[PDB]
Design a protein around this ligand. Structure first.
Ligand SMILES: CC(=O)N[C@@H](CCCNC(=O)CP(=O)(O)O)C(=O)O
Ligand SMILES: CC(=O)N[C@@H](CCCNC(=O)CP(=O)(O)O)C(=O)O
Ligand SMILES: CC(=O)N[C@@H](CCCNC(=O)CP(=O)(O)O)C(=O)O
Lengths: 332, 332, 332
């Protein structure tokens, strides 16, 4: 059974096919690829674009999406094995995935880390459990990676430059400020797809404590050696931005501080100058700027940058709809 | 771009066309006016009829409604401009409206005042922001006015009297009791449409403190001079009800007490006799009674009045579906 | 007007017709029985299978389900008559049911007891009120009985044994452990349908305090005399399980302790050995095991039992979709 858990699991040819089908769907939005079919959208965390785009995507292809929120409307779910369920969880994922598999044709799942212990969060237990027990394809709607975002982002870049080949472009993945410590998922995914696409990637972050999990740094290294791109880490803003063709910003909590955030608060607070403003963008090669959203204006990026004609964030957001339709079509 | 924010923004001819299309849709509920199209229903407050009628209306016309609740499932939204978003809000309406505009064909928004400062609530910031940033038509699902309710109400009245021309009828908009201070929206809208329709309107309320915002009293004055109706404020129950053809009740907090409600509590509590009962309705010219709902029985109106054959509240509620379908059809 | 409140209200012929239509729908899932029609799914409590199966069932038959949660998105509802609504409830069921009746073609309602006073909960006020005031058919999505579960369960059994005739089979309805006191609905329904089907039923529970309400014991007695089955209560595990063809487990709070649960805690806690494990199932005649779900593994039933080929819980869960489609088709 084929699932869409990570782009890293897919061959470059398969990903190129997905991006092309996405472009095709963007030209002809209504279809029958999902006629009479359905997808269960399981959300363990908030969402506006993901829920809306998947729900509309299902509708536009003749199917139907059922939106579920365990702990809210649906019953809370247990993922650990062999435990005595006398706690807060009401049922086990074994039953949840098997039951949904009798109803729907696809299952999407969104589950952010708990931010208590990265050793536990990095195992991707929720997503892996759905893929293990589900008799139908499972789609990652964001856990510790965000593959749907990767493709929406990639398509937006190929559209901007007018070509599917992004090799040679200088890509800057920069950490940015935020009052709270967030998920590294989008950053992990950006690093992954940017290198898979063969760009010259620079991971710009405040300190070594903000470097991404080795798993993704390794994927990136492997992707560069295969795509012909490059990878490097930087703690110097001006050098990183210089000559950049693309700048993608995202805020995330330092992995070393999982379960111990109050000491990280003062640390991030002394780097709010990482905010993407006109000055930094002016150092780029008339580069484009994007963000996965939701975005806090004048915190992660300034009003000027967001409203500049070089910001393609709205186009990338729109593309979530198109690439997800390609993903669902491919899996059914 | 044409939006449906207030009936006051529309010409009488346009409103008559809407009411006629609504009557047509009531005769032939299924259609293809929204085939393959979608509407985002953004709710910042509770709703039963509005969510249900819009959702079903979209379905019946071949489209699909996506229901969103910022702060619940969707991310909280910032509306103020140029501020540093380090608070509770996660994203700005500029991005929210632009993104939704890439997904849906229409956006409906429900956002009640915050009841802290009427000077701020009366600006209609949420609705105006959606209309400003959205590339697609925006529909008022109730903010400080409730135009969809106005048309459902108007159609019910024209149906009751068997004619679209309501000129000459004595219309009584009466305040009624409620344990809590509520939105003036429905009252503002009733005053607006009743005068736009050319009826002889009487705004019956306990004291001058309960008179509606000048904005609506002015709209009413302008509407009367154009429709041939009349407007007057009253604090005397029996004189107002006498010979009335229509009685529309709604409870609302006195505008002067925004941000200072505890002193208003004792005030409203001494006027619970404003409740619509058989005695008051017996003073009317065999008039009809209606309410926008939800309604607290034996508080806002008695069981007898609600169950009387003169109560058209259920018909008005049904009409929300028909007039909203006419509105969506007109905007697409 | 015909509603689906309880199987006990339906003749055996009508129920057999429903089960047969359910089997037919399971073979041909897409249809037009609900084309352009809609159902309002009103949930006062959590749900995963019920919401998902009804929503998908409506979609597969060409209709649309509107999911409502009073107190969450919809307004809270008052059911008592003639009271002064100055409390938490915003509107009365009289208005709610009448309004929904102008929008949808069917109304489903889920409302568990409040667990404070069984004398009040056993009256089934919510369900009865919807049936009383609704101009359209009402469907029980679980209140104090769970008729939809009864049919899904019955169909799964007929499928397992390869025949609609279950007479002669030894059926064991056993109480099982759970940290909290739960609804007797599923148990009441199991007892009802198992006897209606003519099986030899044994109600196995810890003590006389866990025996079901007389109403259901009476229905069972009446069903046995008509179907040719049998009914008996047992407090001995091994004797009950011996030679059983079917074992259905469910946990529920002792009726005598409604409104007084802390003293019941120690009582249930001394019977957690009622859990369905391999040892008890090995005493049966290679019998099948099922549960309505959600199920707490290693509490209500062990991992071994849940994963055994004799467990048909997933099939019963799937059948909720098919029997509910038969129910909606029959009522429209
Ligand atoms: C603040 C916060 O927690 N952010 C998330 C955004 C995820 C990407 N964004 C999306 O998928 C868009 P939507 O479907 O509207 O959430 C994060 O940090 O990973
Ligand atoms: C108590 C309360 O806050 N009431 C609202 C009712 C609005 C009109 N009513 C509707 O639009 C019907 P529904 O869509 O079911 O809310 C108010 O006072 O403005
Ligand atoms: C723990 C709890 O409260 N359980 C419920 C389960 C009801 C039957 N189960 C269903 O209808 C399945 P779903 O639609 O997913 O809830 C009870 O005890 O009655």
């Amino acid at each position: 059974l084929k699932h869409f858990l990570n782009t890293q699991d897919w061959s470059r040819a398969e990903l190129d096919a997905l991006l092309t089908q996405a472009a095709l769907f963007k030209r002809n939005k209504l279809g029958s690829e999902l006629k009479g079919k359905s997808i269960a959208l399981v959300f363990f965390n908030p969402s506006m674009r993901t829920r809306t785009s998947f729900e509309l995507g299902a509708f536009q292809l003749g199917g139907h999406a059922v939106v579920l929120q365990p702990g809210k409307d649906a019953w809370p779910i247990e993922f650990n094995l062999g435990t005595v369920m006398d706690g807060d969880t009401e049922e086990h994922i074994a039953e949840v995935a098997r039951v949904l598999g009798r109803y729907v044709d696809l299952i999407g799942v969104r589950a952010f880390p708990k931010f208590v212990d990265w050793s536990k969060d990095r195992e991707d237990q929720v997503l892996k459990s759905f893929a293990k027990y589900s008799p139908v394809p499972v789609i990652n709607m964001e856990t510790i990676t965000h593959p749907c975002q990767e493709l929406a982002h990639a398509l937006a870049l190929q559209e901007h430059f007018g070509t599917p080949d992004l090799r040679g472009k200088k890509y800057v993945l920069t950490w940015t400020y935020h009052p709270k410590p967030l998920n590294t998922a989008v950053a992990n995914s950006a690093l992954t797809i940017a290198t898979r696409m063969g760009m010259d990637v620079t991971l710009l972050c405040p300190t070594p404590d903000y470097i991404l999990d080795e798993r993704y740094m390794d994927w990136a290294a492997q992707n560069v050696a295969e795509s012909g791109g490059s990878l490097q880490v930087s703690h110097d803003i001006d050098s990183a931005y210089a000559g950049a063709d693309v700048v993608y910003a995202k805020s995330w909590g330092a992995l070393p501080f999982f379960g111990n955030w109050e000491p990280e608060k003062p640390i991030r607070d002394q780097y709010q100058h990482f905010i993407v403003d006109e000055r930094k963008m002016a150092l780029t090669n008339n580069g484009v700027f994007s963000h996965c959203l939701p975005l806090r204006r004048n915190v992660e990026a300034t009003d000027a940058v967001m409203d500049s004609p070089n910001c393609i964030a709205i186009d990338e957001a729109e593309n979530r709809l198109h690439v997800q339709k390609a993903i669902m079509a491919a899996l059914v």
